[PDB]
Amino acid sequence: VVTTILESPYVMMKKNHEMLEGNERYEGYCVDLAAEIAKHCGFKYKLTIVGDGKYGARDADTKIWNGMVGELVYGKADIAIAPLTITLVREEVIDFSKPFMSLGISIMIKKPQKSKPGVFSFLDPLAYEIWMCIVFAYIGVSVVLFLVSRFSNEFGIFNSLWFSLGAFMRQGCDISPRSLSGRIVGGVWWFFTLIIISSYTANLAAFLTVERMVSPIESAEDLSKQTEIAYGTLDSGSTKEFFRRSKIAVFDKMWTYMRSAEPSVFVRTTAEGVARVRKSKGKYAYLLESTMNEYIEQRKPCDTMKVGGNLDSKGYGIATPKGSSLGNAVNLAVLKLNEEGLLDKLKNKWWYDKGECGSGGGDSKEKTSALSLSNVAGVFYILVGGLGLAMLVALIEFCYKSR
């Protein structure tokens, strides 16, 4: 007479549960765990799911345990082969195994996918500092060419800025320097433009060929500092109580943010939380138990992923009432299962082998597409802006010269 719980990856009801019902045919990770714990410790067990459907807790006035703690303290069932977060209160009333699985408060974010190419994206292949240095190098070269042609000759400032700009944009030059000191400047600026244009084309080809996606946030230590991404918990439970009772600097900040923030970042249920993460953009991050997050990221549509380590560690046990002669028959078997590499094999199978998606198959899967007008339109805007400006200055010069 062992209890259980209905969490999907641990104890699940298979297709056509009417035909296959009861201890004879169940599916789940905890089901295989119970089978193996019986194989190591032969005993009569009947899978009696908890009636209440939840884990232990005591009401302050009622002072009674309910779920898989009430089913154990009150002799309603032998043990509880199900995920129990080992904790002080539960231990004080049950006898806990050595943790057969350790976990923590993971961070859940939507899988980083390529954004819409912004306006002014054409100047991505070169850093901002390089663009500014290009502008001021052009303005320095033109001034020096002017000064050189006016020591020792139509290279006035206006007519030399045009030559430098013509030489940069690969379009043929109208005139060429004749002196030696003008020709040195011409030659070195020609070399400079050649190298820069080759660098821009090559780096753009690198951008287009292999795409490299980066997670916007890596760990909660930086998620606290960001604050442009909203991150939320479940309503109330281990996670919220942990954050309110925390005293570490980063966690205290991550709680002060979420305590006073609008709208309601706290989510009613984990299904709503994952739905909100998937629906929204990368502006929402969800803080849940590590196991649930690892499991969720494997099912369809595989649109989410786990980032960063576990914030605080706690383990899952196999409960047993204090006076049981079976109390010490489970510690040793759990330790042996953990040491044999059997529990890890069970989890690996149950989570990755029964996985909706695989990482290796879509690892590269690279396909290239034609440059849409969205990528480029940042230069069409500049073109039409330049034309409008040219007409404007033409009218200004005309009006000034007419009077």
Partner 1 sequence: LGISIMIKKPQKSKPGVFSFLDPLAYEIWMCIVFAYIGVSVVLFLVSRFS
| Contact set with ligand POV (CB under 6 A) | 118-120, 381-382, 384-386, 388-389
125 annotated to bind ligand: no
154 three-class SS:
coil
Query: CB of 361: closest distance to partner 1 in angstroms?
Result: 16
304 three-class SS:
strand
Query: CB of 380: closest distance to ligand POV in angstroms?
Result: 9
Question: What backbone torsions phi and psi does residue 315 show, to the nearest 5 degrees?
Answer: -120, 165
Q: How many residues bind ligand ZK1 (CB under 6 A)?
A: 12
Query: CB of 159: closest distance to partner 1 in angstroms?
Result: 17
Which stretch in 146-154, 238-246, 342-350, 386-394 sits in contact with partner 1 by CB under 8 A? 386-394
Per partner kind, with CB cut-offs from 5 to 8 A, the member of ligand ZK1, partner 1, ligand POV, none near residue 358 is: none
In sequence order, the β-bridge partners of residue 79 are 2
Which stretch in 215-223, 249-257, 265-273, 383-391 sits in contact with partner 1 by CB under 8 A? 383-391
The answer for residues whose C-beta is within 8 angstroms of residue 39's C-beta and 6 or more apart is none
389 part of the interface to partner 1, by CB under 8 A: no
* Among the listed residues 95, 289, 294, 297, the single contact to ligand ZK1 using CB under 6 A: 289
Query: Which helix (H) or strand (E) segment is 206 a member of?
Result: helix 180-209
Query: CB of 158: closest distance to partner 1 in angstroms?
Result: 16
Distance CA 110, CA 267 (A): 16
The answer for residues whose C-beta is within 8 angstroms of residue 11's C-beta and 6 or more apart is 4, 5, 26, 27, 28, 29, 30, 31, 49, 82
* Among the listed residues 206, 371, 382, 396, the single contact to partner 1 using CB under 8 A: 371
Query: Which helix (H) or strand (E) segment is 147 a member of?
Result: helix 128-151
∠ CA 164-388-155, nearest 5°, is 20
394 part of the interface to partner 1, by CB under 8 A: yes
Which stretch in 78-86, 224-232, 336-344, 369-377 sits in contact with partner 1 by CB under 8 A? 369-377
* Among the listed residues 60, 373, 400, 403, the single contact to partner 1 using CB under 8 A: 373
Per partner kind, with CB cut-offs from 5 to 8 A, the member of ligand ZK1, ligand POV, partner 1, none near residue 118 is: ligand POV
* Among the listed residues 2, 11, 81, 84, the single contact to ligand ZK1 using CB under 6 A: 84
Q: Contact, 311 vs 105, CB < 8 A?
A: yes
Q: Contact, 122 vs 378, CB < 8 A?
A: yes
CA distances (Å), 226 to each of 164, 217, 219, 254, in order? 44, 8, 11, 11
Distance CA 35, CA 40 (A): 9
Which stretch in 34-42, 81-89, 171-179, 277-285 sits in contact with ligand ZK1 by CB under 6 A? 81-89
Query: CB of 388: closest distance to ligand POV in angstroms?
Result: 5
What are the E-state strand segments in 36-156? 79-80, 101-103, 105-110
Q: Contact, 65 vs 3, CB < 8 A?
A: no
249 three-class SS:
helix
Q: Which residues bind ligand ZK1 (CB under 6 A)?
A: 7, 55, 83-85, 237-238, 270, 288-289, 291-292
Q: Which residues are annotated as a binding site?
A: 83, 85, 90, 238-239, 289
Q: Which residues are annotated as a binding site for L-glutamate?
A: 83, 85, 90, 238-239, 289
